[PDB]
């Protein structure tokens, strides 16, 4: 009754069946066949894109640029119609409270020409 005494109770792992994959709308999947006799041959079978060792960086960068382009195009095509979208022009005005433009332009031109000059000189 009172003052329960806990003893060394050993319990075995309850791994009788595993649910490798769980689908939507129910439908349980018991992929694990629990075998070894065939697992030896399965392991004997064992006994990143095409190549993709050189130019991997270039490849990925261009892919990402293409993806951004595509996303913008998708949004523009979704505005092309009134299907799940809008275009109401809220009479606003992007007011920039600084001389951002001039400075921005200057710095941009400077660094772009730096790159150009560098390339030319190197060549």
């Amino acid at each position: 009754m009172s003052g329960v005494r806990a003893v060394r109770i050993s319990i075995e792992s309850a791994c009788e069946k595993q649910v490798h994959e769980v689908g939507l709308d129910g439908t349980e999947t018991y992929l694990p066949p629990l075998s070894m006799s065939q697992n030896l041959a399965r392991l004997a079978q064992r006994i990143f894109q095409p190549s993709l060792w050189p130019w991997d960086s270039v490849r990925n960068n261009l892919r990402s640029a293409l993806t951004e382009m595509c996303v913008l195009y998708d949004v523009l095509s979704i505005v092309r119609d009134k299907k799940f979208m809008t275009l109401d022009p809220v009479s606003q005005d992007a007011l920039p409270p600084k001389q951002n433009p001039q400075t921005l332009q200057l710095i941009s031109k400077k660094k772009s020409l730096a790159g150009a000059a560098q390339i030319l000189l190197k060549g």
Binding site: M1, V4, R5, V7, R8, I9, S10
Partner: protein
């Protein structure tokens, strides 16, 4: 089982609340509500008539778990001792099949 019992107790109340609500808000409604309440009440009774007074759970629980630990140890030993000797069979009996294979290939 216990979750079903809790849900049944909560529903027993559901048919009370619902019954009174209906009343404040014809004869067939009261009849079905009464039948519903009586049915679920009898179901709760027969479900309670299941879980027992119970006993042990320690004194017998502790003794049983200790015996089970001892028997698990002895059964592990028996199954392995069989297993060392079981695997022994396949070990050099497949090498006996390989001796036969070697003698056949050497011909």
């Amino acid at each position: 089982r216990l979750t079903q019992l809790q849900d049944a107790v909560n529903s027993l109340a559901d048919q009370f609340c619902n019954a009174i609500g209906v009343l404040q808000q014809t004869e067939e409604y009261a009849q079905l509500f009464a039948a519903l309440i009586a049915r679920t009440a009898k179901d709760i009774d027969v479900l309670i008539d299941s879980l027992p007074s119970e006993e042990s759970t320690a004194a017998l629980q502790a003794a049983s778990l200790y015996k089970l630990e001892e028997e698990n140890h002895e059964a592990a030993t028996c199954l392995e001792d069989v297993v060392y000797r079981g695997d022994m069979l396949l070990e050099k009996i497949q090498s006996a099949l390989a001796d036969i294979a070697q003698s056949q290939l050497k011909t």
